[PDB]
Ligand binder design. Sequence first.
Ligand SMILES: COc1cc(Nc2nc3cccc(-c4cccc5nc[nH]c45)c3o2)cc(OC)c1OC
Length: 302
Amino acid sequence: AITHHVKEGHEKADPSQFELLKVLGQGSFGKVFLVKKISGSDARQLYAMKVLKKATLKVRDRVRTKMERDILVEVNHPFIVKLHYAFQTEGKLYLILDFLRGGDLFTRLSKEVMFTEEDVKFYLAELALALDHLHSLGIIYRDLKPENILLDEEGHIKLTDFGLSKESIDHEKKAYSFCGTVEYMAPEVVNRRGHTQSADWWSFGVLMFEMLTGTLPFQGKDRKETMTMILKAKLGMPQFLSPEAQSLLRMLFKRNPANRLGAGPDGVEEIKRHSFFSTIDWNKLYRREIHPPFKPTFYFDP
Ligand SMILES: COc1cc(Nc2nc3cccc(-c4cccc5nc[nH]c45)c3o2)cc(OC)c1OC
């Protein structure tokens, strides 16, 4: 067949259509800004804009920004951020995402020092559904940390950054990269022996421990000592933790990923049926019908 030498025409989304309001923080590969849509049907809408600068030379951050875009286009879940636009200019990549009005879980944790078990059970329950959804698509999230868990106006969670995630992990395939925050890494990530979706359940345990106690379970004087402490996995259990919390933590902190809670044939059901989550109605939770624990004039002359 002979090629028809013609070009398709489209009205392209451009960064000039988003008014820059303020910097929200730093994602895995660039800054995140609060922006307001100028034109079109969604004029006046607030969004979070993630920008990757000098994308042409930054090959590794560019390949992963594309994977992040691909992941966000594929996913449709209540607890995973929605992507509204993705576009590029010379040397820059842009992702336009939901603006989460409640800020991140790290800010809340830092202010409270530690959460009550009721609050932890809520956050972890929504997170378990989000992680399982990703796992069902062959994705390893890998970057669990409270900075990556955002809260909406109602107090429900959203996972928002997929730059360090891994796609196409199914059957006998393993990932071998060493990316993410060290303290949350599974031992198989630290020793470079290969990791699968079961690495996320170790990270889920670290996050659970940190939210319940205000401290990290495996941590040394520097990142290299933290790495060896993860490999020894000698856990000091704080005595204010309930028997249900202690059971879940011991079941997640299995160094052998094959023996870890959630790695068995029933997958996420092993976690959902744990006594720690016995009061959770998972159907109501998915429907966003469970009330979150936190939801983000003087003149008088009657
Ligand atoms: C990170 O801090 C905030 C984020 C947000 N909202 C927000 N919606 C987002 C959607 C996607 C990504 C981010 C984001 C923003 C900054 C750092 C991030 N790390 C992971 N995700 C990050 C969003 O941040 C709102 C905040 O206050 C109202 C806020 O406190 C300054």
